[PDB]
Each structure stands twice: as C-alpha cells, then as structure tokens.
Amino acid sequence: ASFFTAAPLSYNTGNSTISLDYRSPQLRVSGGALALTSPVFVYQTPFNTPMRLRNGTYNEYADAHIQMVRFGTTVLFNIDVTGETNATGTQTWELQFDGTLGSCLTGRMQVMGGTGEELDVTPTFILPTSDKSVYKQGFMPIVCSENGEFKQSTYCSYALTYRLGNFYITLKSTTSGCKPIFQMSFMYESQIGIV
Amino acid sequence: GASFFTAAPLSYNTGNSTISLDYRSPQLRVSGGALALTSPVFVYQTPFNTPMRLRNGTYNEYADAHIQMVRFGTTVLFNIDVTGETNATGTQTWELQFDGTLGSCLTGRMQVMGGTGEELDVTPTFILPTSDKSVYKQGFMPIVCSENGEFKQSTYCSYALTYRLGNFYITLKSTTSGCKPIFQMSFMYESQIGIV
Amino acid sequence: SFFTAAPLSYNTGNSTISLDYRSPQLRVSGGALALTSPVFVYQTPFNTPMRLRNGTYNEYADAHIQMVRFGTTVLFNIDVTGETNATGTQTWELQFDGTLGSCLTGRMQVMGGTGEELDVTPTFILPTSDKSVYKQGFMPIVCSENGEFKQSTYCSYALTYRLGNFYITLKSTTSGCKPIFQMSFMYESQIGIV
Ligand SMILES: [Hg+2]
Ligand SMILES: [Hg+2]
Numbered sequence: 050a051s052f053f054t055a056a057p058l059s060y061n062t063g064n065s066t067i068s069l070d071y072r073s074p075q076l077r078v079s080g081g082a083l084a085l086t087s088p089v090f091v092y093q094t095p096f097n098t099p100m101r102l103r104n105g106t107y108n109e110y111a112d113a114h115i116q117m118v119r120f121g122t123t124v125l126f127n128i129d130v131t132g133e134t135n136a137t138g139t140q141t142w143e144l145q146f147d148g149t150l151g152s153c154l155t156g157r158m159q160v161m162g163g164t165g166e167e168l169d170v171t172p173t174f175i176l177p178t179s180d181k182s183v184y185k186q187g188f189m190p191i192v193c194s195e196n197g198e199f200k201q202s203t204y205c206s207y208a209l210t211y212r213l214g215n216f217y218i219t220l221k222s223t224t225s226g227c228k229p230i231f232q233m234s235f236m237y238e239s240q241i242g243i244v
Numbered sequence: 245g246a247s248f249f250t251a252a253p254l255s256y257n258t259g260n261s262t263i264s265l266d267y268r269s270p271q272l273r274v275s276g277g278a279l280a281l282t283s284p285v286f287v288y289q290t291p292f293n294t295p296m297r298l299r300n301g302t303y304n305e306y307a308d309a310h311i312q313m314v315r316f317g318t319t320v321l322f323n324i325d326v327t328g329e330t331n332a333t334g335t336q337t338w339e340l341q342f343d344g345t346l347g348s349c350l351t352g353r354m355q356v357m358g359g360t361g362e363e364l365d366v367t368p369t370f371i372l373p374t375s376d377k378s379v380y381k382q383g384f385m386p387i388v389c390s391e392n393g394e395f396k397q398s399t400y401c402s403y404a405l406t407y408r409l410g411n412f413y414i415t416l417k418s419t420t421s422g423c424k425p426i427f428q429m430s431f432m433y434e435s436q437i438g439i440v
Numbered sequence: 441s442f443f444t445a446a447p448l449s450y451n452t453g454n455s456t457i458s459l460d461y462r463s464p465q466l467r468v469s470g471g472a473l474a475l476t477s478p479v480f481v482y483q484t485p486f487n488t489p490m491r492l493r494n495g496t497y498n499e500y501a502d503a504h505i506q507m508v509r510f511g512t513t514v515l516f517n518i519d520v521t522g523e524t525n526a527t528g529t530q531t532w533e534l535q536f537d538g539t540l541g542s543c544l545t546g547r548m549q550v551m552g553g554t555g556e557e558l559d560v561t562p563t564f565i566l567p568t569s570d571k572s573v574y575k576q577g578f579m580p581i582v583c584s585e586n587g588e589f590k591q592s593t594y595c596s597y598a599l600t601y602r603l604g605n606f607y608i609t610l611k612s613t614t615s616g617c618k619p620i621f622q623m624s625f626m627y628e629s630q631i632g633i634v
C-alpha cells in the first residue's frame with residue numbers, strides 16, 4: 050500500500066502478494082528458486098589438466114582435453130587428443146562415466162561455469178536415455194597432424210553404450226603412420242532433463 | 245522509513261518508495277514487464293526417438309532424420325543425423341520445408357524443447373534467416389558415409405537455405421556412390437529475427 | 441501485512457525480502473542478477489562481413505565470423521568467400537586486442553539474442569590471459585563455388601600472441617579453387633565472465 054514495485058516485480062492488491070513476473074520459455078521456478086529453462090552447462094576437463102587415455106589394453110597413451118556442452122536437451126561433445134607415440138592401425142580411446150551421476154571415472158572432469166569457477170552440480174545432464182538401452186554411433190572426418198604440419202585426412206568413429214550400469218563414449222581413430230593428434234566433435238541427445 | 249529490508253539483487257529506493265530488481269543488462273532484460281534473457285537458448289528439434297521421414301526427390305528412396313536446431317544469440321546451429329536403408333547411387337536430395345512466417349516444420353514433426361525435457365509453447369520463428377525472404381546462404385560440409393559401425397566413404401554434403409512460395413527451405417545434397425546415406429552433419433547460420 | 445510468492449521469499453528473523461535462485465544457473469554480480477554461464481556472441485554484424493587480405497597479396501576475402509562463449513568454451517565459426525582463385529596455401533589473419541579482445545582487423549560486435557548490440561568488452565574471446573600452451577590444429581573443409589563442389593581439402597588454425605595482441609591465423613590450402621568454405625573449432629577461455 051505505501052510502496053510500489055518496478056517491473057519485473059509486481060504487487061497484487063487482491064491477495065497482498067509481491068511476485069516476480071518472468072517469461073516461462075526462458076526462466077522457471079524449481080523447488081521455489083528461480084532457474085533457467087535451457088541453462089548452459091559444461092562438463093569439461095579442467096584448464097591445463099588433460100585426461101590421460103589408454104589405447105585399448107596396450108601401453109600406448111594420449112592426452113585429451115574434453116568439453117561436453119549441454120544446451121536444451123542436446124550435448125555437444127568435443128575432444129582434442131594429442132598422443133606422443135606413432136600408433137598402430139586403428140586405436141580405441143574410451144571414456145567411462147557413472148551411469149547414475151554422470152561422473153567421469155576415467156579421469157578428472159568438472160562442471161565449469163562462465164565465471165571460471167567449478168559448479169556444485171552432479172553431471173547427470175551428459176547421460177543419454179535414463180533407461181540404459183542406447184544405440185548411437187557414428188563417424189566424423191578428422192585430420193592427423195604434428196608440429197603444425199599436415200599428416201593425414203582420415204576418419205574417427207564414435208559410439209555411446211551402457212555396460213554394467215556405466216555410460217561409455219568410445220572413439221575409434223584410424224591412423225596409419227601418423228600420431229593420434231586431432232580435434233573432433235559430435236552431438237547427441239540427453240533425455241535426462243535438468244531440474 | 246520502511247519496516248522491511250531487501251537483499252541483493254532486490255533493492256529498495258527510499259526516494260520513491262519503490263522495490264526493484266537489479267540485473268546486468270547484457271545477460272537479462274525486461275520484456276513487456278517480465279524478466280527474460282538477453283541471449284536465451286532455444287532448440288527446435290525432432291522429438292526423442294521420433295525421427296522424420298525424408299524422401300530423395302521423387303525416387304522411392306527414403307531416410308530417417310533426427311534434427312536439432314539450436315539458437316544462441318542470433319546464431320542457429322543446425323545438426324542432422326540421417327540414416328537411409330536403400331543404397332543410393334549418385335547425388336541424393338533431402339529437403340526440409342518450414343513455414344516462412346512461423347517457422348513450423350511442414351516436412352515432419354518438430355518441437356521446441358527446453359532443457360527440462362518439456363515442450364515449450366513458443367512459435368519457432370527463431371530458426372528463420374532474414375525476415376522476408378531474400379536469402380542465399382549455401383555451403384558444403386565434409387561427411388563420412390558408414391554402415392553397421394563400419395567405414396564406407398569419405399565424401400561431402402551440400403546445404404542451401406532458400407525461400408520459395410513464402411516457405412523456408414533447407415536442402416541437403418549428399419553425394420554418395422555405392423554407400424547408403426548414413427551420416428551426421430552440422431552447420432551454422434544467422435537469424436535476423438530477434439527473440440524480443 | 442503482505443506476502444511473497446516464490447521465487448521471492450520473506451525471512452521474519454531479519455525482516456528481509458530475498459530472491460531465491462539456483463546458484464549453478466544464476467548469480468549476483470556487484471549486487472545485480474546475472475547468469476552463471478551466459479551466452480555471449482562476438483560476431484561480425486548482420487550483412488557486414490569483414491574484409492581479409494591474403495598475406496601481402498592483392499587477394500581478398502569477405503568473412504562472416506561468430507565467436508560464441510558458452511561456459512568457458514569459445515566456439516569459433518567462420519564463413520569465408522573470396523573472389524580470386526588462389527593457388528597454393530593462403531593465410532587469413534584475425535587480430536584482436538590482447539587485453540580487451542576488440543577486433544582490430546575489422547568491425548565486430550557483441551550481439552544479444554534480441555538482435556541488439558550489447559555494451560560488453562569482448563575479453564571473453566581471449567584464451568589464457570598470459571599466453572601459454574594451446575590451440576594450433578587442423579579442420580577438414582570443402583572449397584566450392586556457385587553451389588558446385590570444387591575440392592575436399594584442409595584448413596589450419598593457430599591462436600598466438602604477438603606484441604600484446606591475440607591472433608587467429610587460418611591457413612587454407614587450395615590448389616586452383618577459390619577460397620570459399622565454412623570452418624569451425626572450439627577453444628578455452630581462462631578469462632571468467634564475473
Ligand atoms: Hg577417433
Ligand atoms: Hg547431404
């Protein structure tokens with residue numbers, strides 16, 4: 050009565066209630082707190098902290114920077130591999146995630162905000178299908194290189210699967226004489242909604 | 245003065261007795277008196293496990309397509325995951341048709357999906373380039389035809405955005421030779437239509 | 441003698457009205473509401489491509505450029521289109537201020553989803569505030585013309601600092617085709633939007 054509300058705040062004299070007006074397609078209320086409808090979350094390898102990946106059961110290794118960007122219900126997966134050995138024929142890199150929480154078991158990953166800071170969010174938003182019966186494989190063209198010099202044009206396979214209640218992303222690069230040094234990216238869908 | 249206080253981001257001004265929300269204008273804004281984002285993310289996509297059936301020109305070759313169209317800022321990221329059963333030979337033409345005023349996919353069912361998983365009641369105009377119909381964005385993208393998780397071909401896929409008869413078209417021209425049309429591809433384009 | 445509807449809350453202990461928000465998605469920044477992971481796009485303006493020169497040659501190209509910040513990731517996308525038929529490798533170079541991020545090569549703007557220009561210093565496009573280690577790489581591309589296939593080939597990218605300025609240097613290798621291609625890559629920005 051003896052105060053007013055500037056938009057987006059509103060007062061209703063009928064029920065004596067102060068409210069926040071918001072556009073529902075962009076923002077929403079979640080357990081009584083304001084949230085976004087389509088927030089951006091990134092589960093990534095930390096700054097300057099690549100993950101060490103093993104080629105199958107061999108004692109061949111590579112350093113990987115990984116970003117997993119959630120927008121809407123899409124996950125954009127991006128990996129920047131860099132091995133020191135000149136590999137074999139096909140090589141198999143495997144990321145393993147907890148099937149309930151999404152936490153990377155293979156190596157250290159963090160939910161990072163735009164502030165730079167680590168967010169206290171369980172990374173379930175990277176999991177496809179809450180039901181563990183997922184299909185999705187595919188190929189992507191890549192370029193093996195070294196010291197900023199072109200080596201090969203070739204391809205990289207990807208596959209998403211569940212085994213023993215754990216989510217796997219399995220990449221199959223096919224080099225021949227070159228080292229496994231390449232960036233690749235793909236998109237997939239997460240049925241798990243962000244609450 | 246007042247018999248109450250305001251924690252940030254709420255503020256009280258004792259001069260005009262008014263409660264406000266303080267917000268950073270580059271990130272948030274007010275739109276018809278309601279709070280909104282400056283650069284919201286919207287996705288117009290094929291529904292979960294509900295691919296769209298596309299036909300290759302007038303031929304009896306078909307393909308199932310999952311499609312995502314992600315709006316950030318004024319950029320649209322278009323992603324398609326095709327999978328055909330016939331082995332095509334030569335170039336094949338897949339064509340998506342959208343309403344030129346509303347953006348609604350006429351070719352098959354698509355929905356605006358939020359990050360919650362829920363369908364949003366939003367007209368998909370945010371996927372339209374150039375308000376009113378003189379667009380000429382085309383390009384090529386390299387792809388990999390495959391089958392049963394086994395490598396077939398490295399090849400290319402053309403894309404073109406056009407208007408015809410007040411309708412927005414996205415036309416993809418994959419050039420396989422012996423392989424089935426099975427590939428993911430993605431490109432970015434601009435939408436002049438602001439989300440205001 | 442008033443109530444608060446969620447997400448507004450009243451605490452009778454300290455007589456204080458608050459906004460409840462989920463901290464992973466929203467936050468307070470100098471007392472104002474903001475996003476945790478806002479989307480910012482530093483781009484060439486609508487219908488305003490940037491004119492790029494191939495080294496010291498009198499060969500030019502028009503480039504549309506988007507630099508999309510999500511979290512701490514920058515997605516870089518360029519759509520080049522030249523009129524000359526180059527032969528051999530060609531070098532396109534984008535130059536940005538190393539402290540502010542402002543494109544020195546040509547006009548770029550922070551554009552919101554509304555279409556409007558945002559008054560934001562484009563520091564969010566800068567990788568590593570003190571030079572460091574990463575981001576040279578290659579990406580496969582397709583040279584074309586008039587919507588007709590020319591070449592499958594490759595494009596190099598490199599992020600470097602020289603004289604306190606951030607450079608993005610693309611090295612397309614055509615051999616008779618015009619330089620007409622889209623390419624995109626991702627990199628990390630240590631500079632937090634705070
Ligand atoms: Hg690979
Ligand atoms: Hg195609």
Ligand SMILES: [Hg+2]
Nearest residue numbers: 595610611612
């Ligand atoms: Hg290039």
